[PDB]
Scaffold this motif. Structure first.
Motif, PDB file in Angstrom:
ATOM      1  N   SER A  96      10.983  10.790  16.846  1.00 16.89           N
ATOM      2  CA  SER A  96       9.755  11.428  17.295  1.00 16.89           C
ATOM      3  C   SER A  96      10.102  12.658  18.120  1.00 16.89           C
ATOM      4  O   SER A  96      10.876  12.571  19.078  1.00 16.89           O
ATOM      5  N   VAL A  97       9.537  13.799  17.740  1.00 15.93           N
ATOM      6  CA  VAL A  97       9.689  15.045  18.481  1.00 15.93           C
ATOM      7  C   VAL A  97       8.388  15.290  19.230  1.00 15.93           C
ATOM      8  O   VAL A  97       7.320  15.381  18.616  1.00 15.93           O
ATOM      9  N   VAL A  98       8.468  15.397  20.552  1.00 19.82           N
ATOM     10  CA  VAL A  98       7.279  15.484  21.388  1.00 19.82           C
ATOM     11  C   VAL A  98       7.114  16.916  21.874  1.00 19.82           C
ATOM     12  O   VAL A  98       8.083  17.671  21.992  1.00 19.82           O
ATOM     13  N   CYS A  99       5.865  17.297  22.136  1.00 20.46           N
ATOM     14  CA  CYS A  99       5.538  18.624  22.642  1.00 20.46           C
ATOM     15  C   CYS A  99       4.379  18.483  23.614  1.00 20.46           C
ATOM     16  O   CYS A  99       3.331  17.932  23.257  1.00 20.46           O
ATOM     17  N   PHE A 100       4.570  18.964  24.841  1.00 21.72           N
ATOM     18  CA  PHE A 100       3.579  18.860  25.905  1.00 21.72           C
ATOM     19  C   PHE A 100       2.987  20.231  26.200  1.00 21.72           C
ATOM     20  O   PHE A 100       3.727  21.199  26.413  1.00 21.72           O
TER      21      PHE A 100
END
Lengths: 212, 375, 220, 8
Positions: A130-134
C-alpha cells in the motif's frame, strides 16, 4: 410517513453572518423541532414546538414556519455553531427526521500539504503493498487526486477519505491509499501522487522513485 | 404566549393523595366501625353520619388509583372500564357526600328551631331520604358516567382517562358540565347550609338574649317584693314574675320541671296575694329565692351548649366554604376559559396547575368532615 | 443532571436478535415516556420507537414494526429494546432519548448511544502498518508521519498518538470499506527536531476484538 | 388543544 426535505444540504458561513436553512414537508405538520449534532457526539435539542427556544440554547437560534415550510435561523454565526442540523416533524406517529444540513465554517483558501509514503517493511514481508498519500490542512474540501505508476494513471485500488472540518483551524485533510500486490509493486519504480485543487492552477505533485 | 408550563409541580401530588388516603380512610373506618358498635337504635342523625362516612370512605377508597394516575403523569393503564367505574364512582361519592352534608344541615335546622320533630317516624322518613339522596347523586353523576372514557393523547404520548365529549362541541359540553358541577355541587348546598346557619344563629342568639332578659326581670321583681309592703304592689310584681317565667319557659333540652315548678309556686303565691295575705306571700317569695338560687346550675348548661352549638355550626359552614370553595372557583373561571371569555394563556395554565390541589382540598373536606361531625 | 447510558451493542449475524438497555438516572423514570432513535453510519437520525410511562401507549417505526419490541422497567429505571430478525439495514448507533415532559414527541435528553453492526463477517483485529518517509527528506522541514490500520471488523477503533510533548497535528481519517473489511489511517505532524531522535508511537485500540497495538515508526 | 383530564 411525512417526508422532510432540508435545503441546502451543505452550506458554509463565516463568523458574523446570518444563516437560514429550510425544511419542507410533504404533508402538513403540527409541530417542528430542530436538533444540532457535532461529529462524534450525540444530538442536542435546539428548537421545540416550531418556534420555541430550548433551555441553554443561545438566542441567536430561532425557528419559524408553518404548514409545510419551516426554517432554522442563526442570527449571528459563531464558530461553535458549525455542525449538522436536523428537523423532526410531529403531526401523527410515526416520527420522521430530515436528511440533515451540514453547516461548515467558511475559511480562507488553504493549499494542501502533500506527503507520500511507500509501503512499510511489515506489509512487504506480509505480502501486500500500500502506497499512502496525505493531503493535510487544505480548504475548500473539494480536491481531486490521481495516482500514477510510471506515468500511467491508476485508480483501481485507491481509497480517499476526508476528515471532518478540523476544529483547530477550520481546515480539511484527506488520505489516499493505493493498495496493490507486492508483485506489481516490485515491477514498477515511479509512484506519483497528483492532486488538483482550487488553490493552484497546476496540479500539486508528490512522487518518489524506488531508486532513491 | 404559549409555552410548556412547569410540569414539575405534580411530583408531590401522589404523596398528598396517599396521605389524605391513609388519614381520611383510617378516620372514616373508625367512625363507620363505631356505628357498627353502638348501632343507634332508630335514630336520625346517626344514620346520616354513617352514610356520610361511608360515602367518604368509598371516595378515599378510590383515592389510591388516582394517586397512581398522578404518579405516571396522566397515564391511565387500568382500562376504559375502570376509568368509567372509578371516575363515575368518585363523582358519585362526592355528590353523595355533599348532599348528605346539606341534608344534615337541614335536619339540624329542624332539630333546633322546631324541637317538635322528635318522633320515630323521622328514621322511617330517612329510609326514603337516603335512597333519594343516592338517587339524586346517581342522576347527578350520569354525565360523569356517559362521557368519562379513555382516549389517546399523542402530543403527550399518553392514554388519558378523560371526559370524552364530542369533539365538535367539546368546549360547550365542558363549560356546560362544569356549570352543572358549580350549581349542583356548591351553589345550592351553600344556599341551604348558609340559610340554616343564619336560622340557627338568629333563633339561638335571640333565644339566649330573651332568656337573660326574663331572668333579670325575675331577680328584679323578687327584690322588689322583698322590700315593698303594699296592697297592689306584691300582686303586680308577682304578675311580672309569672309572665317573665312563662316567656322564659321556652327552653327545651329537668329544665321543664324547674320552670314549671317556679310557675306553680308563683301561681299559688299569687293565690295568697289575691286573698290579702302579704307576709305569707313574702315568705313564699323567700322560698322562690330558694328555688331559683337552687336552680342556677342548669342555666349555665344552656349557655355552654349555646356556645358549643354555635361553634359547631360556624365550624361546619367555614369548613365547607374553605374546603370546596377553590375547586368551584377554578372550575367556574375555567368554564369561562372554555367558552372563550378567558383566553389568556398563562392564566389557563395557572388554572391547570391549581385544579388538582383544589381537588385534594375537597378530598380534605371528606377527610376532616367525620372528625368535625362525629367528634 | 440527567444520565442515560445505553448498553448491549455489538456484532450480530443477520436474522439474529439483541437486547439493548438504557439505564436512566437523575430523575423520576416512571413519569415520562421514552424513545429509541437510531442513526445509520454516515447518515442521519431515525426515530425507532416510543413507550409511555405506564406502557399503555407504544409506537413503532414502520421499518422496525413487527420485529422490535420496546419494553420498560420502572422499578429498575431501565428501558429495553428487543431487536429480532436483524438485517444489514438495522446497523446503526442506537440512542434512547426522552423529553422529560409527559412523553412529548421531542428529544431533549440523549444517551451515549450503543453501536449495533449486523453482518455475517467475522471479528478481525486490525493490521497496523507504520507510515514513515522513504528516504531522509533532508530539507529540515517538519516531519509528517502516519499509521495505516488495514483489515479490521467491526467499525470502531481509536488511534492515540504518543509522540513528543505537544507540537503535533493529528488527523484521524474515517474508515472505508475495502475487500469486505474496514481500513483507515491516522497522520501526525511533528517538528524535524523530534523524529527520529525522539520516539513517536501510534496506539490502535480495537475493543471489539479487545486488541491494542503500539507501532514505533522506525525510519526506513 | 385542551381536554379535561382531572378526575372531577
Amino acid at each position: 410517513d411525512i417526508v422532510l426535505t432540508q435545503s441546502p444540504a451543505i452550506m458554509s458561513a463565516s463568523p458574523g453572518e446570518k444563516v437560514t436553512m429550510t425544511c419542507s414537508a410533504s404533508s402538513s405538520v403540527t409541530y417542528m423541532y430542530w436538533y444540532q449534532q457535532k461529529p462524534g457526539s450525540s444530538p442536542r435539542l435546539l428548537i421545540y414546538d416550531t418556534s420555541n427556544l430550548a433551555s441553554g440554547v443561545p438566542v441567536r437560534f430561532s425557528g419559524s414556519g408553518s404548514g409545510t415550510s419551516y426554517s432554522l435561523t442563526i442570527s449571528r454565526m459563531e464558530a461553535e455553531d458549525a455542525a449538522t442540523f436536523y428537523c423532526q416533524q410531529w403531526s401523527s406517529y410515526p416520527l420522521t427526521f430530515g436528511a440533515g444540513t451540514k453547516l461548515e465554517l467558511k475559511r480562507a483558501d488553504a493549499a494542501p500539504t502533500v506527503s507520500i509514503f511507500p509501503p512499510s517493511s511489515e506489509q512487504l514481508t506480509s505480502g501486500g503493498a500500500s502506497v499512502v498519500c496525505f493531503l493535510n490542512n487544505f480548504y475548500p474540501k473539494d480536491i481531486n487526486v490521481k495516482w500514477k505508476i510510471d506515468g500511467s494513471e491508476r485508480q483501481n485500488g485507491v481509497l480517499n477519505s476526508w476528515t471532518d472540518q478540523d476544529s483547530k483551524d477550520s481546515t480539511y485533510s484527506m488520505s489516499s491509499t493505493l493498495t496493490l500486490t507486492k508483485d506489481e509493486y516490485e515491477r514498477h519504480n515511479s509512484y506519483t501522487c497528483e492532486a488538483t485543487h482550487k488553490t493552484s492552477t497546476s496540479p500539486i505533485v508528490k512522487s518518489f522513485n524506488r531508486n532513491e | 404566549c404559549s409555552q410548556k408550563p412547569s410540569d414539575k409541580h405534580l411530583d408531590a401530588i401522589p404523596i398528598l393523595y396517599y396521605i389524605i388516603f391513609v388519614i381520611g380512610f383510617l378516620v372514616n373506618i373508625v367512625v363507620v366501625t363505631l356505628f357498627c358498635c353502638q348501632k343507634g337504635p332508630k335514630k336520625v342523625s346517626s344514620i346520616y353520619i354513617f352514610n356520610l362516612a361511608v360515602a367518604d370512605l368509598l371516595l378515599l377508597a378510590t383515592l389510591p388509583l388516582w394517586a397512581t394516575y398522578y404518579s405516571y403523569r396522566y397515564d391511565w393503564l387500568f382500562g376504559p372500564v375502570m376509568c368509567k367505574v372509578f371516575g363515575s364512582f368518585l363523582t358519585l361519592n362526592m355528590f353523595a357526600s355533599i348532599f348528605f352534608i346539606t341534608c344534615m344541615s337541614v335536619d339540624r335546622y329542624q332539630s333546633v328551631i322546631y324541637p317538635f320533630l322528635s318522633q320515630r317516624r323521622n328514621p322511617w322518613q330517612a329510609s326514603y331520604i337516603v335512597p333519594l339522596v343516592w338517587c339524586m347523586a346517581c342522576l347527578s353523576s350520569l354525565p360523569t358516567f356517559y362521557f368519562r372514557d379513555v382516549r389517546t393523547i399523542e402530543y403527550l404520548g399518553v392514554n388519558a382517562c378523560i371526559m370524552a365529549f364530542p369533539p365538535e362541541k367539546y368546549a360547550q359540553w365542558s363549560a356546560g358540565i362544569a356549570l352543572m358541577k358549580n350549581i349542583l355541587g356548591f351553589i345550592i348546598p351553600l344556599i341551604f347550609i348558609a340559610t340554616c346557619y343564619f336560622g340557627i344563629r338568629k333563633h339561638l342568639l335571640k333565644t339566649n338574649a330573651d332568656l337573660e332578659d326574663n331572668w333579670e326581670t325575675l331577680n328584679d321583681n323578687l327584690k322588689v317584693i322583698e322590700k315593698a309592703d303594699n296592697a297592689a304592689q306584691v300582686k303586680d310584681a308577682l304578675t311580672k314574675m309569672r309572665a317573665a317565667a312563662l316567656d322564659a319557659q321556652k327552653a327545651t333540652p329537668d329544665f321543664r320541671h324547674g320552670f314549671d315548678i317556679l310557675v306553680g309556686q308563683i301561681d299559688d303565691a299569687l293565690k295568697l296575694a289575691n286573698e290579702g295575705k302579704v307576709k305569707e306571700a313574702q315568705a313564699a317569695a323567700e322560698q322562690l329565692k330558694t328555688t331559683r338560687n337552687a336552680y342556677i346550675q342548669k342555666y349555665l348548661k344552656n349557655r355552654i351548649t349555646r356556645d358549643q352549638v354555635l361553634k359547631m355550626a360556624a365550624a361546619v359552614v367555614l369548613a365547607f366554604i374553605i374546603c370546596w370553595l377553590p375547586f368551584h372557583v377554578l372550575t367556574f373561571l375555567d368554564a369561562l376559559a372554555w367558552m372563550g371569555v378567558i383566553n389568556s394563556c398563562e392564566v389557563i395554565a395557572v388554572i391547570d396547575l391549581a385544579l388538582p390541589f383544589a381537588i385534594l382540598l375537597g378530598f380534605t373536606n371528606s377527610c376532616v368532615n367525620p372528625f368535625l361531625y362525629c367528634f | 443532571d440527567v444520565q442515560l447510558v445505553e448498553s448491549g451493542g455489538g456484532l450480530v449475524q443477520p436474522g439474529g436478535s439483541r437486547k439493548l438497555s438504557c439505564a436512566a438516572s437523575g430523575f423520576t423514570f416512571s413519569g415520562f415516556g421514552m424513545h429509541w432513535v437510531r442513526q445509520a453510519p454516515e447518515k442521519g437520525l431515525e426515530w425507532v420507537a416510543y413507550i409511555s410511562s405506564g406502557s399503555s401507549l407504544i409506537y413503532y417505526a414502520d421499518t422496525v414494526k413487527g420485529r422490535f419490541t420496546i419494553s420498560r422497567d420502572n422499578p429498575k429505571n431501565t428501558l429495553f429494546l428487543q431487536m429480532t430478525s436483524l438485517r444489514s439495514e438495522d446497523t446503526a448507533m442506537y440512542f434512547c432519548a426522552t423529553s422529560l415532559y409527559y412523553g412529548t414527541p421531542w428529544f431533549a435528553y440523549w444517551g451515549q448511544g450503543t453501536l449495533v453492526t449486523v453482518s455475517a463477517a467475522k471479528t478481525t483485529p486490525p493490521s497496523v502498518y507504520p507510515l514513515a518517509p522513504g528516504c531522509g527528506d533532508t530539507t529540515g522541514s517538519s516531519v509528517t508521519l502516519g499509521c495505516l490500520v488495514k483489515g479490521y471488523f467491526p467499525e470502531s477503533v481509536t488511534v492515540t498518538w504518543n509522540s513528543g510533548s505537544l507540537s503535533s497535528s493529528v488527523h484521524t481519517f474515517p474508515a472505508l470499506l475495502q475487500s469486505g473489511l474496514y481500513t483507515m489511517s491516522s497522520s501526525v505532524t511533528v517538528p524535524s527536531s523530534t523524529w527520529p531522535s525522539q520516539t513517536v508511537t501510534c496506539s490502535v485500540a480495537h475493543p471489539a476484538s479487545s486488541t491494542t497495538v503500539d507501532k514505533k515508526l522506525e525510519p526506513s | 388543544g385542551r381536554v379535561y383530564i382531572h378526575p372531577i
